[PDB]
Amino acid sequence: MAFNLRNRNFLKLLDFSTKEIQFLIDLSADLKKAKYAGTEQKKLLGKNIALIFEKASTRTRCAFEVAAFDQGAQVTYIGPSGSQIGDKESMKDTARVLGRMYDGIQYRGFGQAIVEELGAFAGVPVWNGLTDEFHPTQILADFLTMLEHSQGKALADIQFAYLGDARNNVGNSLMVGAAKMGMDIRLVGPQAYWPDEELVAACQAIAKQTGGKITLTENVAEGVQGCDFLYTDVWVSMGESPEAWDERVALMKPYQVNMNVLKQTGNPNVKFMHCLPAFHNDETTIGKQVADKFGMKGLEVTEEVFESEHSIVFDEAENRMHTIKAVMVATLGS
Amino acid sequence: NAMAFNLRNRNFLKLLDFSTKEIQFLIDLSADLKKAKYAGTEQKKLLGKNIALIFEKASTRTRCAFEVAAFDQGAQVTYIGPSGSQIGDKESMKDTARVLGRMYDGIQYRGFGQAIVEELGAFAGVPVWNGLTDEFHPTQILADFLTMLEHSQGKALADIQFAYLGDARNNVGNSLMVGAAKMGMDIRLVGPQAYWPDEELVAACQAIAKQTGGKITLTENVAEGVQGCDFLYTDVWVSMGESPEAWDERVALMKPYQVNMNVLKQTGNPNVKFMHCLPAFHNDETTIGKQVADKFGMKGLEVTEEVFESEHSIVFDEAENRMHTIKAVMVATLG
Amino acid sequence: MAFNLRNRNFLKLLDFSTKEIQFLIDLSADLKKAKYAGTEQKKLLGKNIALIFEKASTRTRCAFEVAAFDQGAQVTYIGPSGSQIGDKESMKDTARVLGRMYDGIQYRGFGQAIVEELGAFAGVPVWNGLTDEFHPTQILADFLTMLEHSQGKALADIQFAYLGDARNNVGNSLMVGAAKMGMDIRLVGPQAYWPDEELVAACQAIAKQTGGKITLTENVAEGVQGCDFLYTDVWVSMGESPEAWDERVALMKPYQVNMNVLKQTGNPNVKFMHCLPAFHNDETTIGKQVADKFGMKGLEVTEEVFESEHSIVFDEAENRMHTIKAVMVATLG
């Protein structure tokens, strides 16, 4: 497997087989154990990595940096300003220049087309740290986390529901991943925000080969029944207009993950997941503005759920690093 | 070493969180690490550690000190600047703390209310170091006391007399007063009464000082405040984050507390040394300093160029010592 | 030259002799070989470098970072905001503080006077990563690249033309460098944008000693006749007001490097160079806005040229790193 991943880009899970994805998750677990044991071998010694961010990030950027450092690599962070990218230099040119100096490149930003163009022109591995359409490294971490908290199930045995805006990058990626791994995923939200028809048809085609199931529904009780995990994300994503809150809060509010939703699973051990950052109280400037305008306290999840014993969001966040490390080691390591 | 043991895994949020002997230990360790770097004998005690540096205010010395100290000790760093991350607009400090705590071995924070750094320190689960808040600037004062010891030819801190002039209730004034009380020093806070430190903080420091033999004097009178001082210290009259409307109201109030050569002469001490945490407004070579001094027809604000560039000024030794003392804090808490 | 380069600042090519510049070029080639062979020895192990940027950068910043990393050094990037520089703290004070903590300092920004002040006060080597007036590290990379693509010619044997805005940092530095190395350079552009007369005079004096030739001309046909390389750069530089485009497109467009200009060289082996970033199509926001407004496809260079077999811009861009490495190794190693 390892050999088959060296020099690969990591642009989207549609580009990877079931067994490649399982391999990456297994490698993540091995690297995690090694870091905890003090026995990590540095497979990226002497390698230099460029991290391009055109959107804000805490987890993803930090995960890249720490993963690189632990593995012996050095990093250059190219933030939303300070470089020539976009205003003064094309992505084809930036890809070719960075490919001359760096051993691998991460990109977070806007359209998937941009990352694909980087991936085609750079000549070194390119990794997608989030695009408007997909967020592949997040789902690797999510699946590692589900396996850790399931105590001996395979992925193909796990049932989970994603609530809210199912057509954002995280919803898209969860559906693709669930299909690839034979899981039972429910997307529970307003029909206007279900994923793109062609993406759903592609994933259903995949799911019929892997034994996976994909349910779209507006009905919370039906969607969440028997779930091991409940997942949600912000209702308006980076780059979108705040006028979207006016269009969406009324449609999404029934899909807020609150204690009643956990109770509707019927599963006393239900675990709550969120990719983060989350709006669960008034301790952010945006969350407070939205909550005040619409008369809410927490948006996609309440404080009571987010801070409960059912919440595994910080384990999930940690696993961003271990899984990003696995991607870099598989694609760039010795 | 008992001090070393009790310091492992601690935050460094404020000097009020450390004993007199712990603070002495950190100063002593700083001197050892300084000697080691100069001799080429420094051992890397932070090999494989990763540190996150959160900055919500600008910085040259503190940022650079944390980076170089980490680098020298074998650690790697992530700088998380005023924007580019999810902090504050999209993610709470409690959440940020817990996430960073999962990935990094230690975290620096520079920013606004002390309450924020305290929250980060409670929630992170790894050492959190305060690189400046509105209320306190603890790493600065470690550097200052190492510098005073290096320039005092064998005197202990408990033997040193010093005055801080100007805005005595800013972070550095607050911290100098706590540090002086801890270490048994004689400190005079010299400034307008409205800018004296909070009465509750003064009372806490007077209690600390009674057991160490320290002395705390608050006065508006410069000549009585500086008599006999080994060191004179000042800082800008308007601090980061305060409204810049304050310059109009404060320059004329604070101008009597400018450190100039007459003030040095009022000490009556030919060996007097001048200290400033930096950055300093001492001429027309900054945009802000030039605009505010020109408004009053002044050449320099809190300190003159004549004092700042004199043989009495030890500000660049003090600046260098920011690195060696931040190194001690990180080695003690994570080494 | 080894003894002579240790602890030096690298503020402008005017400060270096012909032999020192050739030594840096030769060292860059040796370091490039070592990285490609996997034999690179770390001569900056344990050194810490500060990188101050008051203007944007992709190549220069990345070059300094990768060069340092490869050589065992660590770096602090101090970007256009986040520090106390300028508004709160003087450059004399900044220099002195950074000199206490770091082993070397890079500066990219505005007036050359600022970098000179930093180099006078820091007490450690200071390197100019671009100023309004000069861009010395670029020209090292450019001359390394010419030597690689000239089939055994020496620099003193090479003829080249720079087209467009001759008084920008890159035009200035190419003229200085051409003078130092005995080259035949033509600066080809509108006379309002020819380099300062005092700098031209200084370069002519240098050229008299080295056998170099410096020509200023508005004539493209004559200017490019026989050249081995054609070089251009954007018509409006960082820190200039965007209103400059309206003045300069009409004056500069006859100096666009297009396939007809390459043809006018009479040289089937002519190669095209550009410091980058370049406006050669509509795939940047500034480039698209300006070109669309003026009915053009590409500004200083066309796509047809830039993506042609004659274009060596990515080799040149790579060479930014190997040449910055040499500057650091020579001055701090």
Ligand SMILES: CCC[C@H](N)C(=O)O
């Ligand atoms: C990690 C952030 C994911 C969110 N859907 C967004 O794109 O903002």
Ligand SMILES: CCC[C@H](N)C(=O)O
């Ligand atoms: C190091 C800066 C200290 C100053 N009192 C401020 O807070 O701006």
Ligand SMILES: CCC[C@H](N)C(=O)O
């Ligand atoms: C490397 C950029 C060169 C250009 N003359 C500028 O100053 O913008």
Ligand SMILES: [Cl-]
């Ligand atoms: Cl994906």
Ligand SMILES: [Cl-]
């Ligand atoms: Cl609830």
Ligand SMILES: [Cl-]
């Ligand atoms: Cl304090």
Ligand SMILES: [Cl-]
């Ligand atoms: Cl004076």
Ligand SMILES: [Cl-]
């Ligand atoms: Cl030059």
Ligand SMILES: [Cl-]
């Ligand atoms: Cl053409």
